[PDB]
Amino acid sequence: GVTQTPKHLITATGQRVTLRCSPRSGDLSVYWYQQSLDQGLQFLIQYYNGEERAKGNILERFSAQQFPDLHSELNLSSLELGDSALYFCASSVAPGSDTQYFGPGTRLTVLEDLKNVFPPEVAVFEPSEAEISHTQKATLVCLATGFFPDHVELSWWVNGKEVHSGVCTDPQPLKEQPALNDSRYALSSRLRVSATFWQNPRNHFRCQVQFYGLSENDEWTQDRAKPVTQIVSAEAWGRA
Amino acid sequence: QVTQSPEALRLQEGESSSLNCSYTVSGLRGLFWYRQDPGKGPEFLFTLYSAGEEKEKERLKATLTKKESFLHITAPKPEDSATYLCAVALNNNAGNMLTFGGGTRLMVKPHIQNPDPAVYQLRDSKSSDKSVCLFTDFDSQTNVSQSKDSDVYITDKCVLDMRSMDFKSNSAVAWSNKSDFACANAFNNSII
Amino acid sequence: DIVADHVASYGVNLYQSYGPSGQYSHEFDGDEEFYVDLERKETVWQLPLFRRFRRFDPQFALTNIAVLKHNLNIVIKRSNSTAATNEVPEVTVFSKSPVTLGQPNTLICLVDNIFPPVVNITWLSNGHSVTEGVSETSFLSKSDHSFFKISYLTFLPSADEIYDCKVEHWGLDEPLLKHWEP
Amino acid sequence: DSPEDFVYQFKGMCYFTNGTERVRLVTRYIYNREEYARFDSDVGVYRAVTPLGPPAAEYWNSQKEVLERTRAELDTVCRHNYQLELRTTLQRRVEPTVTISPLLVCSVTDFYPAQIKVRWFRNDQEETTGVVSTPLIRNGDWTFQILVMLEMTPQRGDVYTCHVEHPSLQNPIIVEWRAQS
């Protein structure tokens, strides 16, 4: 029920951002929580019927609102690197001990400068002939490389329809240059299918990577394409 | 104060276990259980207000005493792998906010019925400039370490499930930009 | 009516359109344990011992009051805007302890059958108004859903001073003056 | 001419009998002075009290989460706060101050809890006839008061005794008044 916009946000330090939330239909109370790697899940603030209720150990830099349509806006100003976290909105019917229902969350990454933001390079690798001739299974490997930050969603599309069966993607992306702090990342995904399915030339396989980067607003002052939120894909037709 | 134990739990497919959530205070308004997929929103499971209370849905069963709450998970499946979060509403708190525990990262390792460890070289992409090696069909007791090369990259192990065949398999990917890159020296000192 | 050894309210939640205003308090056997000052966001306990072992967070009261504000506006529509009826309050004045001239004492002014809970309770000495040494309880609930409020005037009784408790309520045509003398 | 007022009351009440053995909760939803809905722990569901209540009672009874939380309040509020009452309100023992003023009024002042027994004596004997007592007086500051008047025709040798029993005392307070002149 709870919706949250945007899903991802990448921004520079000192900037101000607005996270929106739409509570469950009929829910009058909204709660904001921050999930960081350091402090875990922590309460920020609560709104009921347009007014502030419970308040956490929130900073003056942080302020929220609840509109009459009951949607909430969380405003984070003078952003620091420590503000990089997941921000979840929760809603409940009434503002007491009522069950709190969380939204998908907003992932925020605060960087010093946006000059090191890069989209991925996507490549699809055809299945080993030795694999097919031994297991009668064909593993397609997708490799997304050179992207920064790690705000990526990898999906497999067969003949135009998204699939999840026999698909496995890396839990976390690996650092290409571990010695560098703002290192570009790499991620791999596997699609295992039957030998008969891959050997069919009628089948179209496409690895899709949704990269989340810069917005319409954000200024770009480099002589290279702006690394905006974009879809980068690689495809392969079945080989006989 | 709300504490969860263990911080991480490694269970085998069908291996029943329990998750603890202790709360040092007295003055409960409600104890809540959530299940969280990495990066996703915590999904609500159960609410318990009172000691001796119990609730059950599917493979999960939550119980409550004066000191703690247990989350019993009977015969878990790999789909049950998530961060299990315990939260409390309290009289001592400045309102109706939730105080979350640190969570329990549950990992349900699937059972590999027919393990056939093999390393295969994949066909090079005309645009990639990279070469990919695949270590696959190995057992769950077998894992892969990080790379010991500046040019070679080894991913973590990963499980996929072919629904139509009811087949589950483990896999690890290796890649490099080098022309002399071979699969034999890719996983020579990487398999653990 | 329910027969019990002890009757408690955790708590008495009040919100009225006039003001608008509200009240939050906990009661035990007809005595007020505490009230929450909704403007200051503070719990004011009535006995010293209580703070030592008990603590109520003011936000719970403020949150309850917001819910009452919500409920009130829905029920006003359902009742077809039926307003409150003004009751006639009953005033009784008595001393706290036996009167010893020139010694510390407290004058108690009990205002019973208060509805709605909007009232002015003031003290007079020889006809003139007294402001210092005056305290009062919150609106204490009653089973018939009316209220009672008790005002206090600390003083040293004397043969030359006579007191009055002036009570102003909408259920009264003129202010009610209840006289007391040593 | 009088200002219009709309009043709302919520009363979360706990009824305690025989220590901890018996506990009953009643929540009251009141508009002006009218109770329109209630939750009674012995009933276990919301009930309307007037024709103003069915839309609220039916809606809260359709929400299993609301019912669970309200039923649990017998523990989370009543039984919980009673443990805090045993350490506070049910600990309080304020001894009465007993004085006699002259027909003969025995004023028993500032005591807690409410339980009180006052008896009048002329010499050896107890006095039932001439005794008029005020009802128990609540001061509002966690003390009580009671005044017991005695119609007496005092003789020369007479000793008047006010005898007072209260839970705070191990032995009764005996205050005497000797006949004047």
Binding site: - | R29, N92 | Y10, G11, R55, N71 | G12, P55, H80
Partner: peptide
Amino acid sequence: APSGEGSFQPSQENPQ
């Protein structure tokens, strides 16, 4: 340390 006082919550009337 003082223990937190319990308090009853009013049930919320249907807004719609």
